Amino acid sequence: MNSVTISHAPYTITYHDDWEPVMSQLVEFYNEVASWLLRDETSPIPDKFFIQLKQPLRNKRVCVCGIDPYPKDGTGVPFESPNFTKKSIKEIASSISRLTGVIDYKGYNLNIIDGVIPWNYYLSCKLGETKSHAIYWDKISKLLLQHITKHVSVLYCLGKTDFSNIRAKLESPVTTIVGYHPAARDHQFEKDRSFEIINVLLELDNKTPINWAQGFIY
């Protein structure tokens, strides 16, 4: 778990050894469009842009990748809400309760689930404007997705139209699961009971299935 001192002011890089082959290359990208996205205030603070780098990618089995961080109260960890009032996290918790049978979720964090990493396609967005810095992360988003899919067996995406042509953006052949969005993937709410698909896919690849219960906080 090394770190780099780039020519701007993010502090939470702290990249693991798994990201070592590509992290330096990522730095080059951050030397191109740093100011264009840094001119406007972002939903995550610059000290929270690259928080999702301390997690090792070795003993990880499932990747959950979102579209962009929340427009408000950005914490740098996807699906991490200290108030549990956001629509996405609440819908995910309700789906977990309905598919498992656990009630009274006082707390629910996806950072403590064994085998599932919380990920976002775009690493930051402007305050109030979702994925405002879209064209400023396209190379970085593709690099991160390519690095992730080569270390995980399954990929659970968020949103339909946003990840419509994900096959073109993913030249590496990896079994990708077409997941919808909690609130509305295409202006319509969906439920998408497919966690058993991930469980049986992990069972096929000679590894333990994901227990969707370790994330509850009491």
């Binding site: 990896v174 990708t176 077409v178 698909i197």
Partner: protein, 426 residues
């Protein structure tokens, strides 16, 4: 789309992937298609390609035991393992033989008993049967819902050839020497020959089989047959000791690959005689072996099944014998007899003349079509008038030569079947 998820991304696909013991022909044959439906039938990414033909029920068995050693004790269910053709049944599943996938369906009453048994308890993986002397004898029934004794008694209630059982719940350590094998053989007499006795540990999925060998190296005199007309007999090998050797069928006999009128031996047993299996390096080519087999069994007789019907009794009696109807010798009387039997008359229209003649003469549908393909015909009014061969290089096997020699009876049967069809459905 996730309400059913095509039955949870086709959970049966994984079961068929691990269904090595349930080696159904068509199932695994199109299982090559099953995996590659991620872009055609299923969604996302799915691709794979492995095919299989033979059975792998060996996952339901432990290692072999033949050396003298002290074995661990435990709850034992002791059953007799017979020898012969083996088939499995699972709620209407086609009877498939191990290593070949041969489809020989059990009779209708046996099918009813088997499906009633599996309806009583669905934990039965398959019904391991033994087919010796054209007799259907059960051998094993691996399951977890009910004990093997319970399955045997339940199938006895519905009616079936059921083996014996012994309860060895508690017996202390004990040494499994030949004395215990003799005790097991004495408890249940020979009757239908038993190759061994197997014990199941509290309905364990993996079973254990113990046996020894008592092969005698004396002589092989000749391989006789027991044709009586009912197509129920085996080509039993006769040793110079005035005894007989049990054989599954002519297929097993030709797979043995032994030499006649020589000192060759077989896998004889202490109380039985298991047919030899070709594991040596002796010079035994197909040509002379099949030639001597034909010369011993019969000039017209050919290698298929265990029936090898005659040639001079083709006439009209063999047609009635194959149709399971009353004997007859006149065309109109035979037609009337066929009309009287509703099932036979209905099944006649569902069969072609070629297939009906092949069944009447008991020809195999593996080489007869090959012989017909390289055979020019001068035919008139849907009857064979003249026939000749074109490629003789395929006549290496004596069976095709004998079939071509007796092709006159096939032409006669073809003409008879054509006349019957034209007089019955016109």
């Amino acid at each position: 789309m996730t309400s059913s998820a095509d039955l949870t991304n086709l959970k049966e696909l994984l079961s068929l992937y691990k269904s090595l013991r349930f080696s159904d022909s068509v199932a695994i044959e199109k299982y090559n298609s099953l995996v590659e439906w991620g872009t055609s039938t299923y969604w996302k990414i799915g691709v794979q390609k492995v095919t299989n033909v033979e059975t792998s029920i060996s996952d339901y068995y432990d290692e072999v035991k033949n050396k003298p050693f002290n074995i661990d004790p435990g709850y034992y269910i002791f059953l007799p393992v017979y020898f012969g053709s083996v088939f499995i049944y699972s709620k209407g599943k086609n009877m498939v033989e191990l290593g070949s996938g041969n489809s020989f369906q059990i009779p209708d009453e046996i099918r009813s008993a088997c499906n009633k048994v599996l309806d009583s308890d669905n934990g039965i993986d398959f019904l391991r049967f033994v087919l010796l002397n054209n007799r259907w004898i059960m051998e094993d029934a691996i399951s977890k819902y009910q004990s093997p004794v319970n399955i045997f008694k339940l199938a006895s209630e519905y009616g079936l050839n059921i083996p014996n059982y012994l309860e060895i719940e508690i017996e202390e350590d004990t040494l499994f020497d030949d004395e215990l094998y003799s005790i097991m053989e004495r408890s249940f007499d020979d009757t239908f020959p038993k190759i061994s006795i197997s014990y199941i540990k509290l309905g364990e999925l993996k079973r254990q089989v113990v046996d020894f060998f008592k092969f005698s190296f004396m002589y092989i005199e000749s391989i006789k047959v027991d044709r009586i007309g009912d197509n129920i007999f085996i080509p039993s090998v006769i040793t110079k000791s005035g005894k007989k050797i049990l054989v599954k069928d002519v297929d097993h006999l030709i797979r043995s690959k032994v030499r006649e009128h020589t000192f060759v031996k077989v896998k004889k047993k202490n109380t039985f005689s298991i047919l030899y299996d070709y594991d040596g390096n002796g010079t035994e080519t197909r040509g002379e072996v099949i030639k001597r087999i034909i010369d011993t069994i019969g000039r017209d007789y050919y290698v298929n099944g265990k029936y090898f019907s005659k040639v001079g009794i083709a006439g009209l009696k063999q047609l009635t014998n194959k149709l399971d109807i009353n004997e007859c010798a006149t065309v109109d009387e035979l037609v009337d007899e066929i009309n009287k039997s509703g099932t036979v008359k209905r099944k006649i229209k569902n069969q072609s003349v070629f297939d009906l003649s092949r069944e009447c003469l008991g020809y195999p549908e593996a080489d007869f079509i090959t012989l017909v393909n390289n055979m020019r015909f001068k035919i008139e009014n849907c009857k064979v008038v003249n026939f000749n061969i074109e490629n003789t290089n395929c006549l290496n096997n004596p069976s095709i030569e004998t079939i071509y020699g007796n092709f006159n009876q096939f032409v006669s049967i073809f003409n008879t079947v054509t006349d019957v069809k034209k007089r019955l459905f016109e």
